[PDB]
Amino acid sequence: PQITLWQRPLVTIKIGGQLKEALLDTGADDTVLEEMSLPGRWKPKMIGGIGGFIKVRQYDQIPIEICGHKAIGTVLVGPTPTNVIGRNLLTQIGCTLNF
Amino acid sequence: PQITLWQRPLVTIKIGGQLKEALLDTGADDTVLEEMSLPGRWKPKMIGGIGGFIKVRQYDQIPIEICGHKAIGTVLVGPTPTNVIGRNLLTQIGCTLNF
Ligand SMILES: C=CCNC(=O)[C@@H](NC(=O)[C@@](O)(CCCN(Cc1ccc(Br)cc1)NC(=O)[C@@H](NC(=O)OC)C(C)(C)C)Cc1ccccc1)C(C)(C)C
Ligand SMILES: [Cl-]
Ligand SMILES: [Cl-]
Ligand SMILES: [Cl-]
């Protein structure tokens, strides 16, 4: 699809069998989701946003569908203001910016 | 242009007679730049991201050129860790997400 930016680019994602709403965010290196349960072991990561730094849980190799497009990659879980899909997964689904 | 998301999508902007590098950020409602002088009225704003909020000055009706494309809009100025071009200006240069 082609998504214009007059509104927030919110899409439906599916992760762990559940649907959620997430923001397609070309300014984000990483994908960060609000608190949820994921399988397996996690590693620590400190990520920086416009307000400062937060600690998150890093899960690797997680299947996630984004607008119907299948991806499998690193998902960070922590106290983010919104679910954000970053470039690590935007590249998996073949996203570019065009103007 | 078509801009890949393998790397951060950084572009050159011209604003207030200055050249600066900024990140094209579909996740950002607003355009926010590191401290600089701009002419005209402003009012204070709090803006929130990962890690919480920062206080910025909001300037309206500011001319900007982004990757060669002229636009005008609101520019927020304050202690952002990095220069971000948000949707308010991305729309004006006809920037879309595509996959
Ligand atoms: C939600 C209300 C509106 N709120 C914004 O609309 C705000 N938008 C945002 O905060 C975001 O779009 C992110 C802006 C881009 N940011 C640049 C950045 C780069 C380095 C450092 Br150190 C600090 C900042 N990237 C990040 O934070 C990411 N870090 C990063 O990749 O490390 C390299 C991450 C933490 C999301 C992974 C995300 C966002 C979107 C919507 C809401 C909240 C957050 C606003 C426009 C007001 C700044
Ligand atoms: Cl990944
Ligand atoms: Cl504007
Ligand atoms: Cl349009």
Short mmCIF file of C-alpha atoms and ligand atoms in Angstrom, two decimals:
data_model
loop_
_atom_site.label_atom_id
_atom_site.label_comp_id
_atom_site.label_asym_id
_atom_site.label_seq_id
_atom_site.Cartn_x
_atom_site.Cartn_y
_atom_site.Cartn_z
CA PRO A 1 0.00 0.00 0.00
CA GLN A 2 0.86 3.68 -0.21
CA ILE A 3 0.34 5.46 3.10
CA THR A 4 0.12 9.24 3.23
CA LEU A 5 1.00 11.11 6.38
CA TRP A 6 -1.92 13.46 6.95
CA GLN A 7 -2.86 11.15 9.81
CA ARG A 8 -0.66 8.95 11.99
CA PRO A 9 0.42 5.86 10.07
CA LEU A 10 -1.29 3.41 12.40
CA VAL A 11 -1.63 -0.15 11.23
CA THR A 12 -2.74 -3.46 12.64
CA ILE A 13 -0.04 -5.91 13.64
CA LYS A 14 -0.36 -9.49 14.85
CA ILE A 15 2.00 -10.88 17.47
CA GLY A 16 1.54 -13.95 19.65
CA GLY A 17 -1.82 -14.53 17.99
CA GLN A 18 -3.17 -11.14 19.07
CA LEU A 19 -4.00 -8.03 17.07
CA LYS A 20 -2.61 -4.68 18.17
CA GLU A 21 -2.35 -1.17 16.68
CA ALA A 22 1.13 0.14 15.95
CA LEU A 23 2.77 3.19 14.42
CA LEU A 24 5.03 2.89 11.38
CA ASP A 25 8.00 4.97 12.49
CA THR A 26 10.91 5.61 10.13
CA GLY A 27 12.58 7.61 12.91
CA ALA A 28 12.92 4.51 15.07
CA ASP A 29 15.86 2.12 14.70
CA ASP A 30 14.03 -0.53 16.72
CA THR A 31 10.51 -1.83 17.28
CA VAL A 32 9.16 -1.21 20.75
CA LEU A 33 5.86 -2.52 22.08
CA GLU A 34 3.88 -1.83 25.23
CA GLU A 35 4.05 -4.38 28.02
CA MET A 36 3.07 -7.87 26.86
CA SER A 37 4.18 -11.47 27.24
CA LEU A 38 6.60 -13.08 24.80
CA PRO A 39 8.30 -16.48 24.84
CA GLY A 40 11.89 -17.38 25.56
CA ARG A 41 14.73 -15.46 27.13
CA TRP A 42 15.25 -11.71 26.91
CA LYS A 43 18.31 -9.48 27.04
CA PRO A 44 18.63 -5.93 28.37
CA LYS A 45 18.62 -2.86 26.17
CA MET A 46 18.65 0.84 26.89
CA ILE A 47 16.99 2.90 24.18
CA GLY A 48 16.90 6.67 23.77
CA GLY A 49 13.91 8.73 22.70
CA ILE A 50 13.04 12.40 22.64
CA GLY A 51 12.44 12.41 26.40
CA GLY A 52 15.51 10.42 27.45
CA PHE A 53 16.43 6.79 27.99
CA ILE A 54 14.41 3.76 29.05
CA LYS A 55 15.24 0.14 29.80
CA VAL A 56 13.40 -2.44 27.73
CA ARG A 57 13.36 -6.22 27.33
CA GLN A 58 14.83 -7.45 24.05
CA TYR A 59 13.29 -10.56 22.47
CA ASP A 60 14.83 -11.95 19.28
CA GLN A 61 13.41 -13.86 16.33
CA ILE A 62 9.78 -13.11 17.12
CA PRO A 63 7.17 -13.64 14.42
CA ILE A 64 5.10 -10.53 13.77
CA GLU A 65 2.66 -9.64 10.99
CA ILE A 66 2.54 -5.98 9.96
CA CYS A 67 -0.39 -4.92 7.76
CA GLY A 68 -0.60 -8.56 6.68
CA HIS A 69 3.10 -8.73 5.83
CA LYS A 70 5.12 -11.43 7.61
CA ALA A 71 8.27 -10.51 9.53
CA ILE A 72 10.40 -12.29 12.14
CA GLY A 73 12.77 -10.20 14.21
CA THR A 74 13.70 -8.31 17.32
CA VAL A 75 10.93 -6.87 19.45
CA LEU A 76 11.62 -4.63 22.46
CA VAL A 77 9.05 -4.50 25.25
CA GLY A 78 8.81 -1.60 27.70
CA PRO A 79 7.12 1.61 28.77
CA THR A 80 6.65 3.23 25.39
CA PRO A 81 3.89 5.80 24.74
CA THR A 82 2.67 3.80 21.75
CA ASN A 83 3.55 0.61 19.91
CA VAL A 84 6.20 1.55 17.36
CA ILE A 85 7.35 -0.41 14.33
CA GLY A 86 10.93 0.63 13.61
CA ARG A 87 13.30 0.18 10.70
CA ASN A 88 14.39 -3.32 11.74
CA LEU A 89 10.94 -4.59 10.69
CA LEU A 90 10.05 -1.91 8.12
CA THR A 91 12.95 -3.25 6.05
CA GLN A 92 11.63 -6.81 6.35
CA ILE A 93 8.29 -5.80 4.81
CA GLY A 94 9.91 -3.79 2.01
CA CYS A 95 8.98 -0.31 3.19
CA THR A 96 10.51 2.80 1.64
CA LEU A 97 9.89 6.53 1.78
CA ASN A 98 8.96 8.19 -1.49
CA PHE A 99 8.43 11.78 -2.60
CA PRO B 1 13.44 10.09 -4.52
CA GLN B 2 12.96 6.63 -3.07
CA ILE B 3 14.64 6.49 0.32
CA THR B 4 15.74 3.10 1.64
CA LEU B 5 15.27 2.29 5.34
CA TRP B 6 18.39 0.18 5.70
CA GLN B 7 19.93 3.29 7.26
CA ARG B 8 18.42 6.24 9.13
CA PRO B 9 16.69 8.44 6.56
CA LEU B 10 18.73 11.60 7.04
CA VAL B 11 18.39 14.59 4.73
CA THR B 12 19.68 18.14 4.49
CA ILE B 13 17.24 20.89 5.38
CA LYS B 14 17.51 24.62 4.94
CA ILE B 15 15.88 26.69 7.65
CA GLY B 16 16.42 30.18 9.03
CA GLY B 17 19.33 30.59 6.62
CA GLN B 18 21.04 27.53 8.10
CA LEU B 19 21.80 24.09 6.65
CA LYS B 20 21.13 21.18 9.01
CA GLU B 21 20.77 17.41 8.90
CA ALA B 22 17.46 15.94 10.03
CA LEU B 23 15.70 12.59 10.26
CA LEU B 24 12.54 11.91 8.19
CA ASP B 25 10.23 10.59 10.89
CA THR B 26 6.80 9.18 10.01
CA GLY B 27 6.26 8.47 13.73
CA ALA B 28 6.55 12.15 14.63
CA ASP B 29 3.50 14.43 14.69
CA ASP B 30 5.74 17.49 14.82
CA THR B 31 9.03 18.76 13.44
CA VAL B 32 11.55 19.31 16.24
CA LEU B 33 15.01 20.83 15.91
CA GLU B 34 17.91 21.41 18.29
CA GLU B 35 18.34 24.89 19.74
CA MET B 36 18.43 27.62 17.12
CA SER B 37 17.06 31.10 16.56
CA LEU B 38 13.91 31.62 14.50
CA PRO B 39 12.08 34.89 13.78
CA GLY B 40 8.57 35.81 14.92
CA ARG B 41 6.18 34.81 17.68
CA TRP B 42 6.45 31.59 19.64
CA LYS B 43 4.66 29.80 22.48
CA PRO B 44 5.82 27.03 24.81
CA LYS B 45 4.84 23.39 24.26
CA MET B 46 5.53 20.07 25.91
CA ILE B 47 6.12 17.14 23.61
CA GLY B 48 6.37 13.50 24.57
CA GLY B 49 8.22 10.52 23.20
CA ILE B 50 10.05 7.52 24.53
CA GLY B 51 11.56 8.55 27.86
CA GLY B 52 9.00 11.26 28.58
CA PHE B 53 8.53 14.93 27.75
CA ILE B 54 10.63 17.96 26.84
CA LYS B 55 9.74 21.64 26.71
CA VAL B 56 10.07 23.32 23.32
CA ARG B 57 9.31 26.65 21.66
CA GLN B 58 6.65 26.47 18.96
CA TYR B 59 7.16 28.71 15.91
CA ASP B 60 4.46 28.79 13.26
CA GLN B 61 4.59 29.54 9.52
CA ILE B 62 8.31 28.89 9.14
CA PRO B 63 9.69 28.37 5.62
CA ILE B 64 11.81 25.27 5.20
CA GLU B 65 13.41 23.41 2.32
CA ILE B 66 13.67 19.64 2.64
CA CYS B 67 15.78 17.68 0.18
CA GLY B 68 15.09 20.44 -2.35
CA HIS B 69 11.37 20.76 -1.69
CA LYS B 70 9.95 24.00 -0.26
CA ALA B 71 7.31 23.95 2.44
CA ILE B 72 6.03 26.04 5.31
CA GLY B 73 4.87 24.93 8.72
CA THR B 74 5.31 24.74 12.47
CA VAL B 75 8.81 24.08 13.81
CA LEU B 76 9.46 23.18 17.43
CA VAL B 77 12.83 24.11 18.90
CA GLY B 78 14.38 22.71 22.07
CA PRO B 79 16.61 20.09 23.66
CA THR B 80 15.81 17.21 21.32
CA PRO B 81 18.56 14.61 21.05
CA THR B 82 18.22 14.78 17.27
CA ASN B 83 16.65 16.87 14.51
CA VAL B 84 13.37 15.32 13.38
CA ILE B 85 11.17 16.17 10.38
CA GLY B 86 7.63 15.19 11.35
CA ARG B 87 4.42 14.56 9.46
CA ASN B 88 3.38 18.22 9.44
CA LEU B 89 6.14 18.88 6.90
CA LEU B 90 6.44 15.44 5.32
CA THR B 91 2.92 15.82 3.91
CA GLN B 92 3.86 19.09 2.25
CA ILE B 93 6.68 17.56 0.22
CA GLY B 94 4.43 14.66 -0.78
CA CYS B 95 6.25 12.03 1.25
CA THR B 96 4.58 8.61 1.49
CA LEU B 97 5.37 5.19 2.97
CA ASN B 98 5.26 2.39 0.42
CA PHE B 99 5.39 -1.39 0.62
C1 LIG C 1 2.71 9.99 20.77
C2 LIG C 1 2.48 11.36 20.74
C3 LIG C 1 3.09 12.17 19.79
N1 LIG C 1 4.56 12.20 20.01
C4 LIG C 1 5.42 12.36 18.92
O1 LIG C 1 4.91 12.50 17.81
C5 LIG C 1 6.82 12.33 19.12
N2 LIG C 1 7.45 11.31 18.25
C6 LIG C 1 8.43 10.41 18.70
O2 LIG C 1 8.89 10.57 19.84
C7 LIG C 1 8.70 9.26 17.93
O3 LIG C 1 8.16 9.46 16.62
C8 LIG C 1 10.21 8.99 17.81
C9 LIG C 1 10.96 10.18 17.18
C10 LIG C 1 12.30 9.71 16.59
N3 LIG C 1 13.28 9.30 17.63
C11 LIG C 1 14.58 9.92 17.31
C12 LIG C 1 15.53 9.72 18.31
C13 LIG C 1 16.77 9.17 18.00
C14 LIG C 1 17.75 9.06 18.98
C15 LIG C 1 17.50 9.48 20.28
BR1 LIG C 1 18.84 9.37 21.62
C16 LIG C 1 16.27 10.08 20.57
C17 LIG C 1 15.32 10.25 19.58
N4 LIG C 1 13.40 8.07 17.61
C18 LIG C 1 13.13 7.37 18.73
O4 LIG C 1 12.71 7.88 19.77
C19 LIG C 1 13.70 5.94 18.72
N5 LIG C 1 15.11 5.95 19.16
C20 LIG C 1 16.10 5.64 18.30
O5 LIG C 1 15.83 5.15 17.20
O6 LIG C 1 17.38 5.59 18.77
C21 LIG C 1 18.31 5.72 17.69
C22 LIG C 1 12.90 4.95 19.57
C23 LIG C 1 13.15 5.19 21.06
C24 LIG C 1 11.40 5.11 19.28
C25 LIG C 1 13.34 3.53 19.21
C26 LIG C 1 8.05 8.02 18.57
C27 LIG C 1 6.79 8.31 19.07
C28 LIG C 1 5.69 8.34 18.22
C29 LIG C 1 4.43 8.64 18.73
C30 LIG C 1 4.26 8.88 20.09
C31 LIG C 1 5.36 8.82 20.94
C32 LIG C 1 6.61 8.48 20.44
C33 LIG C 1 7.43 13.71 18.87
C34 LIG C 1 7.35 14.08 17.39
C35 LIG C 1 6.65 14.75 19.68
C36 LIG C 1 8.89 13.73 19.32
CL CL C 2 15.40 -7.55 13.73
CL CL C 3 2.29 22.81 10.50
CL CL C 4 -1.33 13.82 -0.70
#
